[PDB]
Amino acid sequence: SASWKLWLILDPRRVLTALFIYLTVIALLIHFGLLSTNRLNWWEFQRGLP
Amino acid sequence: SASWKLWLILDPRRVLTALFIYLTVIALLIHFGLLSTNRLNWWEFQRGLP
Amino acid sequence: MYYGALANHLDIAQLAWYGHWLVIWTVVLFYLRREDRREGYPLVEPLGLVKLPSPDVQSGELPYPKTFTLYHGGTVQAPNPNRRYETRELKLAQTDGFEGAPLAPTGNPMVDGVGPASWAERSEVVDSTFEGKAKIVPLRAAPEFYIAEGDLDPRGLPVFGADGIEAGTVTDLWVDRSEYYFRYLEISVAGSARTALMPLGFASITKDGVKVQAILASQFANVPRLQSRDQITLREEDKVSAYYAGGLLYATPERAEPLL
Amino acid sequence: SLTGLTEEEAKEFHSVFVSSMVLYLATAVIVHYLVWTARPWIAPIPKGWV
Amino acid sequence: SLTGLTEEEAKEFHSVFVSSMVLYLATAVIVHYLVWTARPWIAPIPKGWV
Amino acid sequence: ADFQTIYTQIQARGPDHFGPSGQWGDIDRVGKPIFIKWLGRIGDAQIGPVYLGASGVGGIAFGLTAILIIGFNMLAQVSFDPLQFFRQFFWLGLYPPKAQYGMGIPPLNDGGWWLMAGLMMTLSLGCWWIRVYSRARALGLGTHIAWNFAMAIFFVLCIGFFHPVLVGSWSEAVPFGIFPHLDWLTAFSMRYGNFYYCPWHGFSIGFAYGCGLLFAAHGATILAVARFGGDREIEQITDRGTAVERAALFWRWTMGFNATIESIHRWGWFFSFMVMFSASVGILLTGTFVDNWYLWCVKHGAAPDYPAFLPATPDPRAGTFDPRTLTGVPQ
Amino acid sequence: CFEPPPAISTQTGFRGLSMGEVLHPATVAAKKERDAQYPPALPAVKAEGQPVSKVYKNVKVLGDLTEPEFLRTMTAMTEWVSPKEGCTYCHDEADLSSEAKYPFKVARRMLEMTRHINTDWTSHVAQTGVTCYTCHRGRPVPPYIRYLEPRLPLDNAIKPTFVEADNSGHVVRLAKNTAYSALNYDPFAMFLANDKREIRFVPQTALPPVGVSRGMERRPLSDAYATFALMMFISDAIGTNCTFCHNPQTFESWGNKSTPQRAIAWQGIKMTRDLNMNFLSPLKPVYPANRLGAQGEAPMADCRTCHQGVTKPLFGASRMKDYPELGPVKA
Amino acid sequence: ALLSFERKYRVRGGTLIGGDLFDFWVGPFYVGFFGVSAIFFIFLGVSLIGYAASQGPSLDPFAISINPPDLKYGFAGAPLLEGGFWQAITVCAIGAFISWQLREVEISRKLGMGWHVPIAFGVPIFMFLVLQVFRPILMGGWGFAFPYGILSHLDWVNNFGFQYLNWHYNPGHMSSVSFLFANAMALGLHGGLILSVANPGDGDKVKTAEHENAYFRDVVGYSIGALAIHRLGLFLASNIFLTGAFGTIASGPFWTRGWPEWWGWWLDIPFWS
Numbered sequence A, B: 001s002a003s004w005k006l007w008l009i010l011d012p013r014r015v016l017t018a019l020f021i022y023l024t025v026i027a028l029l030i031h032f033g034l035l036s037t038n039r040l041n042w043w044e045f046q047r048g049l050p
Numbered sequence C: 001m002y003y004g005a006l007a008n009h010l011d012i013a014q015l016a017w018y019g020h021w022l023v024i025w026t027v028v029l030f031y032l033r034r035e036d037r038r039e040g041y042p043l044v045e046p047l048g049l050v051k052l053p054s055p056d057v058q059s060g061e062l063p064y065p066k067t068f069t070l071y072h073g074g075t076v077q078a079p080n081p082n083r084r085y086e087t088r089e090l091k092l093a094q095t096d097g098f099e100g101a102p103l104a105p106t107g108n109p110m111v112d113g114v115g116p117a118s119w120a121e122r123s124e125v126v127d128s129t130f131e132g133k134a135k136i137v138p139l140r141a142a143p144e145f146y147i148a149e150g151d152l153d154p155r156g157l158p159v160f161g162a163d164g165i166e167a168g169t170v171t172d173l174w175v176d177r178s179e180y181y182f183r184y185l186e187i188s189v190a191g192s193a194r195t196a197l198m199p200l201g202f203a204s205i206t207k208d209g210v211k212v213q214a215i216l217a218s219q220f221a222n223v224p225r226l227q228s229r230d231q232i233t234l235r236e237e238d239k240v241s242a243y244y245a246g247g248l249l250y251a252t253p254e255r256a257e258p259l260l
Numbered sequence D, E: 001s002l003t004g005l006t007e008e009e010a011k012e013f014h015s016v017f018v019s020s021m022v023l024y025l026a027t028a029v030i031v032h033y034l035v036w037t038a039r040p041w042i043a044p045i046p047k048g049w050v
Numbered sequence F: 001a002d003f004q005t006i007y008t009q010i011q012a013r014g015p016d017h018f019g020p021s022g023q024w025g026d027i028d029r030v031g032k033p034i035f036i037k038w039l040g041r042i043g044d045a046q047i048g049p050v051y052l053g054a055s056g057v058g059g060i061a062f063g064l065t066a067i068l069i070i071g072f073n074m075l076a077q078v079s080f081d082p083l084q085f086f087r088q089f090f091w092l093g094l095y096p097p098k099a100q101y102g103m104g105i106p107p108l109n110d111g112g113w114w115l116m117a118g119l120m121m122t123l124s125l126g127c128w129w130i131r132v133y134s135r136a137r138a139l140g141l142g143t144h145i146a147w148n149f150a151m152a153i154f155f156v157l158c159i160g161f162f163h164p165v166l167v168g169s170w171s172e173a174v175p176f177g178i179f180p181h182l183d184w185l186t187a188f189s190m191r192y193g194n195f196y197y198c199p200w201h202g203f204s205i206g207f208a209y210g211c212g213l214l215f216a217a218h219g220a221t222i223l224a225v226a227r228f229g230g231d232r233e234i235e236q237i238t239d240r241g242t243a244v245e246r247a248a249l250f251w252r253w254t255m256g257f258n259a260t261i262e263s264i265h266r267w268g269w270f271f272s273f274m275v276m277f278s279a280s281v282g283i284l285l286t287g288t289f290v291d292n293w294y295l296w297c298v299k300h301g302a303a304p305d306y307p308a309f310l311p312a313t314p315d316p317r318a319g320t321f322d323p324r325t326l327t328g329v330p331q
Numbered sequence G: 001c002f003e004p005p006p007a008i009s010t011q012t013g014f015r016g017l018s019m020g021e022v023l024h025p026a027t028v029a030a031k032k033e034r035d036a037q038y039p040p041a042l043p044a045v046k047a048e049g050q051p052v053s054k055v056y057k058n059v060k061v062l063g064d065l066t067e068p069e070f071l072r073t074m075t076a077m078t079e080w081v082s083p084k085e086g087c088t089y090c091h092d093e094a095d096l097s098s099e100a101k102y103p104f105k106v107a108r109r110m111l112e113m114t115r116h117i118n119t120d121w122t123s124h125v126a127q128t129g130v131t132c133y134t135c136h137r138g139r140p141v142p143p144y145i146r147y148l149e150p151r152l153p154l155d156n157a158i159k160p161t162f163v164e165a166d167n168s169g170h171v172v173r174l175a176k177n178t179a180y181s182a183l184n185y186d187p188f189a190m191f192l193a194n195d196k197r198e199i200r201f202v203p204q205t206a207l208p209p210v211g212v213s214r215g216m217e218r219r220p221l222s223d224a225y226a227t228f229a230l231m232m233f234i235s236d237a238i239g240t241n242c243t244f245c246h247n248p249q250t251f252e253s254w255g256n257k258s259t260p261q262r263a264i265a266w267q268g269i270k271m272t273r274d275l276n277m278n279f280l281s282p283l284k285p286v287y288p289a290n291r292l293g294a295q296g297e298a299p300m301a302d303c304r305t306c307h308q309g310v311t312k313p314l315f316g317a318s319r320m321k322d323y324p325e326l327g328p329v330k331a
Numbered sequence H: 001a002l003l004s005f006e007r008k009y010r011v012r013g014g015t016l017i018g019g020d021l022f023d024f025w026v027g028p029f030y031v032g033f034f035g036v037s038a039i040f041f042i043f044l045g046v047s048l049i050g051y052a053a054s055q056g057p058s059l060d061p062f063a064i065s066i067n068p069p070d071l072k073y074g075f076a077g078a079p080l081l082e083g084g085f086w087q088a089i090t091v092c093a094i095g096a097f098i099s100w101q102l103r104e105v106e107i108s109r110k111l112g113m114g115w116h117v118p119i120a121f122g123v124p125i126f127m128f129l130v131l132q133v134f135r136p137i138l139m140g141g142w143g144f145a146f147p148y149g150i151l152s153h154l155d156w157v158n159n160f161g162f163q164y165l166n167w168h169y170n171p172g173h174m175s176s177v178s179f180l181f182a183n184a185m186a187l188g189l190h191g192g193l194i195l196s197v198a199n200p201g202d203g204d205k206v207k208t209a210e211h212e213n214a215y216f217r218d219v220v221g222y223s224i225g226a227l228a229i230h231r232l233g234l235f236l237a238s239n240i241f242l243t244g245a246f247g248t249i250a251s252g253p254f255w256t257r258g259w260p261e262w263w264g265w266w267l268d269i270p271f272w273s
C-alpha cells in the first residue's frame, strides 16, 4: 500500500490539528446533547419517567 | 517507536500550550456542568430530593 | 414645585438648548471656517468688476498664518505667501467674457498641463523617509523591498493603451518605503528609448497584461519625464499623475462631450 | 516533498497514525458496548409505532 | 528540523512528555475511583426506563 | 475604476524596521511582526509590534477583571450550565439593583457585582486613556485622539455613574449584557418620555449622521484623488499638491464652500466629539431638570399633534389614583 | 426566520404615523381554522316545567332553569370541557347529585366565574361574552394557564423538554413568556395575579416634581422594565403590536394618543386581576397536588388564556344568546 | 471669486447632458443641466413645503408635518391637503437628490477624479428610496412612507419600530448601528491622528507617516494605513445604510412578528431545546 505517500502532500500537522478540533467538537456535541435529554442524562436525577 | 520524531515537526511549545488551554476548557466545562445539576452539585445545599 | 424651573415658562433645558446652538455656531463660523481658509485664499477675480483688498495684506477673512516646522528641515506657513501667486502662463483661452465661463485649451492640454492635466506648484524636493532616504523608489534601487510571496509580479507584462494597441512593457515597480506600498509602474514605451512612470491606479493588471483606459498607446510617448532615473520629486509626481488624469477627459475628443 | 517530510518519515508517521486511529476506534467500540450495558439507547420499536 | 529540537532533545522531551501524560491519566483514574466512592454517578437503570 | 481604491492587488514587503523612537518606552515595544495576507488586501498586512507600558497593563487588568465578573454572573444566571450559557448568551446579563437603594452600595445578589464590574471597567478606561494620551506624547504627537476618547469615556460615565448620582439611584444605570443593555435603552426612553423629544438626543444623532456623511464624503474624496497621492495627507498639508486642490474644488463647485486637507480633519474631530458631548449634556439634563421630554416639547410648543383616526378615548383612570405614585414611592 | 409577503396592514392612527396591525395571512388562517372548532350552539329547548331546584337535589348556581334547559347546559359543558371523558369527568356514574369529584366543585365555581364575567365585565367582553370553551377549548385543563413562575411550553398539554423544566432554562422561560425579549421580569406575577402594583410609571409633567424625584423617594427604573415586559406579553397574547392601543409618540397619553382598544385593555387588566384574586386562586384547597404550582398555588388565567394570540377570542365568535344561563344574570 | 489655484481647472467638458448650454459657474457653484434641474426641484419642493405647512395646524418650525395619504388610497394620487402635497414633495426630493448626484458626476469628470463621491451619495439616496418607495410598494401604498417634519418623521420612525415590539432586536438594525458607532469612532480616531501629526505642540516638528503607523501599532498593535483608513471609513459609513436596508425592507414584507422572536431560529434549535 502506498497510502503513506499521503503525508508527502497532506501535511500531517494540519491533519492532526483538524482531527483534534473536529473530534472535540463532535464529542462535546454528543455529551452535552445527551445531557439535554430526560432519557439519557446520566448526571441529573432521573426525570421524565412516570 | 519513532514517535519522538513527532517533536521534530510539531513544536513541543505549541503542543504544551494547546494541551494546557484544552484541558483547562474541558475541566471548567465538567466542573460547571456538574454544578448545574442538583444530583452532583457539591457546593450548594442538597436540592432535587425531599 | 419643580426641579429645573427658572420662571413660570423658563427652564434650564430651554436655555441649554440655545447654549448648545451657540457652541455649535461659534465653533463653526468663528474657528472652523477660518481654518478652511488656509489654502487658496484670498480669492482672486481675474475678470472682476470692483477693487478687492491687495492679496498681500490680512484682509479680514484670512486667518493669521500658522507655522509648520518640517521634520527634516525648515518651515512653511499656512496661508503660504510663497504659494499665493501662480505664474505659469496656462495655455487656455476664454470661451466667453465672464469668470463663470469655462476655458478651452489652446492645444494639447495633457502636455500643457491644464484642466484635469493641471499639476500644482509643489516643492521640487524628493519626499523622504523619516530616516532621510528617498521615499518613492524603483525596486532596482531598493533591493530590500519585494513583492509579497504569491502576488502577481507585473514586470515583463505588456502595457496596452486605451485603443487596445500595445504601448510598452513594464520594467519596474516603484515602492513607497515609508508605507510599504507600491505606487508606480515604470514602462518602457515602444518606439523610443524612454521610460514613463504611471500611477498604479491607472493600471488594470491581469496575468495577460496591463490595460490603461486613461490614454491612447501613442500618448505614452509624451508622459512627463523624470529628471533623475531612480528618484522622483513631489512636483514630478503631480505632473505624471495629472498627465493620465487629463487623458481621462482629453485622450480623444469624444471624452469631452455629453451623452445628450 | 510538498510537506518537508522525507519518505521514511512519511512511513513512520503513517504507521503510527494508522495504529493510533485503529486503537481509538477499537476502544470506541468496546466503550460503546459497555455504555449499552449501562443504557441500551436504541429502544425496540414501541407498540403503536409505524 | 523545523522545530529546532535536535534528535536527542526530541527523544528526551518525548520521554518526559509520555511519562507526564501517563501519570496524569493514572491519577485521573484513581481520582475517579475516589469520587465514585463519594458519588456513584452512573445510577442503575430505573424502573420504567426503556 | 481605480481598483487600488477597492483593494491592494500587489502587496509590498520590506525590512523589519523599528518604528520612530518614542521619548520613552522603546524597551516596551514588543512582538515579532506577523504578516497575514488577506489583511494586506484591505489594509496593512502587518500585525504588531505592540507596546506594553504600565498603563496598558492596567487597562488590561481592570478590563479582564470586569469581564470576569460579568461573565461569571452571566454563567450563574444559567446556573453554570455551559451548553445553556452558549445558547442564551445574548439574553444574559449582569444587572444593577432592581430595588430602590438610592445611591447606597447594594447587596451582591441585587447589584453589588454590577457595581464592582462598573468600577473595574471605569478604571480600565482610565488606564487606557492614559495609554492613548501618553503614547501620543511619547511619539511627539498632539493629544487630539485622547481628548476625543475622553469625551466618549465621559458619556459612558454619564450613563453608568453620573445620571444615577444626579437622580440618586443606582437602579437607573446600564446593565451589562448583549440584549439587556438595549432593553435599558428602551426602558430609559420610556421613563423619561420618548428620547426622540430630547433635543440633545437630536443633536447627538445629527452629529452621528454627520460623522457618517463626513467620513463617507472624505473617504470617497480621498479615494477619488488617490491617483494623485491624496492619501498622503501630511505632505499635502505641508506642500499642497493637485490632489487636495481637486478635492477642494470638487466640494467648492458642489456646495459653494470647501475645507482644506487639514481642516476637514478638524471638522471630523468636531463632529465625533459633538456626538458624545451632546449625548452627555442630554443625559445630565434628563431626570435632574426634565422629567418627560415629550411633555417638555409640548410645553415649549415644538411637539406635533395629530387628529385621531380611531375615536379619541379619555383616560379611564382619570382622577382615580394619585399622580405622585407614577414616579414616587407611595410610602 | 422568514414570512413571505404580502402582509395585512390596518391603520389605527393618523396617516403617516405607521400605526396599525401587521399580520401574516397564513398565521391568521391557521388561527381561524383552530378557532372555528368551536362547537355549534345546541338546539334550543322549550323552557317549560318547574324550576330545577325542585326536581334536583344539589343545584346551587343554575337553579332557575328547568330540566330540559339545565340538561342542555350540561351537554354544552361536557362538549366544552370534557368531550373525551364525558359526564363522568365531573359526576359520579350513579349519583348525579354527588359532588365527590374535585372537577365538580371546580366546575361549580367556574359556572359562577363565567356568569360573573358575562354580567359584571361587559366593559371588556361586550356582547360577545365568554363560555367554558373560551378558555378550555375542549380540554379539562385550558391550554394556556399561569402560575407564580413562568413555564414552558406555553401550551401545557405539550410535555416539556429537559431544559424547559431545568434550572438552566430559567432565562429562556422568561424570554418566551415576554415574546422572546431579554427583559428579566415575570410580569404576570407582578401585575396580573393581583392588583398590588401600578403598571403606569411615566411622569405626567414636563419637569421633575419636588418630593418624588430624588433618591429613596423615586420608583426604581426596574418598574419601567417590568411594564415593558408586561406590554410585550400583552402584545404576544393578543397577537398584535403596541400601535393597536398606543401612539408610541407618548405611551402615557390618552385622548387622541390612544385607541379605544387601550381602554378595553385596561378593563381586561382589571378583569384578569379580579378573576385571579377572587375565583381562580381561592380554588387552591380544591385541587389535587398535581394541579398546583411550585409554591403550591392554584393555576391562574392571563390574557392568553382567552385570547390565545387573537385580538378577539375566537375572532369574536359568540354564544351569549344561545346560552343565557351563562350570563348576563338579571337580578 | 476664484481660489488662488482654481483658474487652471475651470475647463469646458465633462457634462452628461447639455454640453456648453449650462456648462458654467455661478460664483463658486458649478451649474450644468443637473444644477438647473436641482435648483428647479429645490425651489419647487421648498415652496410646496412652505405652502403646505401654512395650511397645517401649527407653524412652529418643529411641529410642522406634511404627511402621506391614508392607507386606503393605495398608490393613487391623494388630495393635496390629504397627502398629495407629500407626494409632490417626495417627487421633488427624489429629483433633487438624483440631480445633485449627477451634477457631482459631472464635476468629478471635469476634475479628472474618480466618481467615488456621487457613488457614495447613491447610498443615502437608495435608503431614502427604500423608506419612501420600495417598502411602500411591497406593503401596498404610499401611506407606509414617512412624513415630512422635524419631529413627525421621528414619530413615524418610533411607531414603525414599535410595530415590531422591539426594533433593537432587528438583526439588520444591529448591523447598521454597529457600523454607525464604528464609523463615528473611526472618524474621531482619523481626524485626531491627522491633527496630532500635523500639530504636535509648541514649536515641535510635524511628524511623518511612520509616526502615524507607530502610534496605532503601539496603542492597539495594528495600523490599517493611510489610504486604507479612507477606504474603511467609506466602507463603514456605506454599510450603515447598506445593511440597515435589509432590516427595513424585511420589516413587514418578510417578517410580521416581533423582532425578538426572529432569534428563535437560534434559541429554539431542538438540539439545545
Ligand code: BCB
Pocket (backbone or CB within 6 Å): F185, H097, H124, H125, H127, H128, H131, H157, H158, H159, H160, H161, H162, H166, H167, H168, H170, H172, H173, H174, H176, H177, H180, H240, H241, H243, H244, H245, H246, H247, H248
Ligand atoms: C422605537 C424605534 C427605534 C428605531 C427605529 C428604526 C427604524 C424603523 C429604522 C431604523 C434605522 C436606523 N436606526 Mg434605529 N436607532 C439607531 C440607529 C439607526 C441607524 C443606524 C439606522 C439607519 C438610519 C436611517 O436609515 O436613516 C435614513 C437617512 C436617510 C435616508 C438620509 C437621506 C438623505 C438624503 C439622501 C439627502 C437629504 C438632504 C437634505 C434634504 C438637504 C438639506 C439641505 C441643506 C442645505 C439644509 C441607534 C444607534 C439606536 C439606539 C441608540 O437605540 C436606534 C433605536 C431605534 N431605532 C429605536 C429602537 N431605526 C433604519 C434601519 O436601517 O433599520 C434596520 C430603519 O429603517
Ligand SMILES: C/C=C1/c2cc3[nH]c4c(c3C)C(=O)[C@H](C(=O)OC)c4c3nc(cc4[nH]c(cc(n2)[C@@H]1C)c(C(C)=O)c4C)[C@@H](C)[C@@H]3CCC(=O)OC/C=C(\C)CCC[C@H](C)CCC[C@H](C)CCCC(C)C
Pocket (backbone or CB within 6 Å): F059, F060, F061, F062, F063, F064, F067, F124, F125, F128, F129, F132, F145, F146, F148, F149, F150, F152, F272, F273, F275, F276, H181, H182, H184, H185, H188, H189, H219, H220
Ligand atoms: C464619537 C466617538 C466614539 C468613540 C471614540 C473613541 N473610542 C476610542 C477612542 C476614541 C477617540 C480611542 O482612542 C480608544 C482607542 O484606543 O481606539 C483605538 C477607543 C476605544 N473605543 C473602543 C470601543 C468602542 N468605542 C465605542 C464608541 C465610540 N468611541 C464613539 C462612537 C464603542 C461602542 C459604541 O460600542 C466601542 C465598543 C476600544 C476599541 C478602545 C478603548 C479600549 C479600552 O478602553 O480598552 C480597555 C481595556 C480592556 C477592557 C481590557 C480588554 C481585555 C480583553 C481583550 C477583553 C476580554 C477578553 C477575554 C477573552 C474575555 C472574552 C469576552 C469579552 C470579549 C466580552
Ligand SMILES: C/C=C1/c2cc3[nH]c4c(c3C)C(=O)[C@H](C(=O)OC)c4c3nc(cc4[nH]c(cc(n2)[C@@H]1C)c(C(C)=O)c4C)[C@@H](C)[C@@H]3CCC(=O)OC/C=C(\C)CCC[C@H](C)CCC[C@H](C)CCCC(C)C
Pocket (backbone or CB within 6 Å): F209, F211, F212, F213, F216, F217, F220, F254, F255, H038, H041, H042, H043, H044, H045, H046, H049, H089, H090, H092, H093, H096, H097, H100, H104, H117, H118, H120, H121, H122, H123, H124, H147, H148, H149, H150, H151, H153, H237, H238, H239, H240, H241
Ligand atoms: C452612508 C452615507 C451617508 C451620506 C453620504 C453622503 N451625503 C451626502 C454626500 C454623501 C457622500 C454628498 O456628496 C452630498 C453633499 O453635498 O454633501 C456635502 C450629501 C448630502 N447629504 C445631506 C444630508 C444628509 N445626509 C444624511 C446621511 C448620509 N449621507 C449617510 C450617513 C442625512 C441623514 C441621515 O439625515 C442627511 C440629512 C446634504 C447636506 C447633502 C445633499 C445635498 C442635496 O441633496 O442637494 C440637493 C437638495 C437639496 C439641497 C434640498 C432638497 C429639498 C427638497 C426639494 C425638499 C425637502 C424634502 C425632504 C424629503 C424633507 C425632509 C424633512 C425632514 C424633517 C425629514
Ligand SMILES: COC1=C(OC)C(=O)C(C/C=C(\C)CC/C=C(\C)CC/C=C(\C)CC/C=C(\C)CC/C=C(\C)CC/C=C(\C)CC/C=C(\C)CCC=C(C)C)=C(C)C1=O
Pocket (backbone or CB within 6 Å): F054, F055, F058, F122, F123, F125, F126, F127, F129, F130, F134, F149, F150, F151, F153, F154, F157
Ligand atoms: C475631565 O477630563 C478628563 C476626561 O474627560 C471626562 C477623561 O475621560 C479622562 C480619562 C478617564 C476618566 C476620567 C474615566 C475613568 C477615570 C477614573 C475612574 C479616574 C481617573 C483614573 C484613571 C485615569 C486611571 C485609573 C488607574 C488607576 C487608579 C491605577 C493607577 C496605577 C498605575 C497608573 C500604575 C501603577 C504605577 C505607579 C503608581 C507608578 C509607576 C507608573 C508608571 C511607570 C507609568 C504611569 C504612567 C503615567 C502616564 C501616569 C481624564 C484623565 C480627564 O482628565
Ligand SMILES: CC(C)=CCC/C(C)=C/CC/C(C)=C/CC/C(C)=C/CC/C(C)=C/CC/C(C)=C/CC/C(C)=C/CC1=C(C)C(=O)c2ccccc2C1=O
Pocket (backbone or CB within 6 Å): F213, F214, F217, F218, F219, F221, F222, F244, F247, F248, F251, F252, F254, F255, F256, F257, F258, F259, F260, F261, F264, F267, H026, H029, H030, H031, H035, H036, H038, H039, H042
Ligand atoms: C443659474 C443657476 C441655475 C444657478 C444654480 C447654481 C447652484 C447649483 C447652486 C446650488 C445652491 C445650493 C442648493 C446650495 C446648497 C449646498 C449645500 C447642500 C450645502 C450643505 C452644506 C452642509 C450642511 C454640508 C454637511 C457636511 C459638512 C459639515 C461639510 C463641511 C466640511 C467640508 C467643507 C467638507 C467637504 C470636503 C471634504 C469632504 C474633503 O474630504 C476635503 C478634502 C480636502 C480638501 C477639502 C475637502 C472638503 O472641502
Ligand code: HEC
Pocket (backbone or CB within 6 Å): G055, G056, G057, G058, G059, G060, G061, G062, G063, G074, G075, G077, G078, G081, G082, G086, G087, G088, G089, G090, G091, G096, G097, G103, G104, G105, G107, G108
Ligand atoms: C363538569 C364540567 C360537568 C360535566 C362534564 C357535567 N356536569 Fe352536571 N353538573 C356539574 C355541576 C358543577 C353541577 C352542579 C350545578 C349547580 O349549579 O350546583 C352539575 C349538576 C348536574 C345535575 C343536577 C344534580 C342534582 O342535584 O340532581 C345533573 C342531573 C347533571 N349535572 C347532569 C349532567 C349530565 C347528564 C352530564 C353529561 C352530559 C353532566 N351533568 C356533565 C358539572 C358537570
Ligand SMILES: CC(C)=CCC/C(C)=C/C=C/C(C)=C/C=C/C(C)=C/C=C\C=C(C)\C=C\C=C(/C)CC/C=C(\C)CCCC(C)C
Pocket (backbone or CB within 6 Å): F067, F068, F070, F071, F072, F075, F115, F117, F118, F119, F122, F156, F157, F159, F160, F161, F173, F174, F175, F176, F177, F178, F181
Ligand atoms: C461612588 C462609588 C462608591 C462607586 C462608583 C463606582 C463607579 C464609578 C461605577 C461606574 C459604573 C459604570 C460607568 C457603568 C457603566 C456601564 C455600561 C455603560 C455598560 C454598557 C454596556 C455593556 C455591555 C454591552 C456589556 C457586555 C458584556 C458582555 C457580553 C460580557 C461577556 C463576558 C464573557 C463572555 C466572559 C466570560 C468569562 C467566564 C469565566 C464566565
Ligand SMILES: [Fe+3]
Pocket (backbone or CB within 6 Å): F218, F222, F233, F265, H190, H194, H230
Ligand atoms: Fe484623511
Ligand SMILES: [Mg+2]
Pocket (backbone or CB within 6 Å): B036, B037, B038, F079, F081, G166, G167, G168
Ligand atoms: Mg440543571
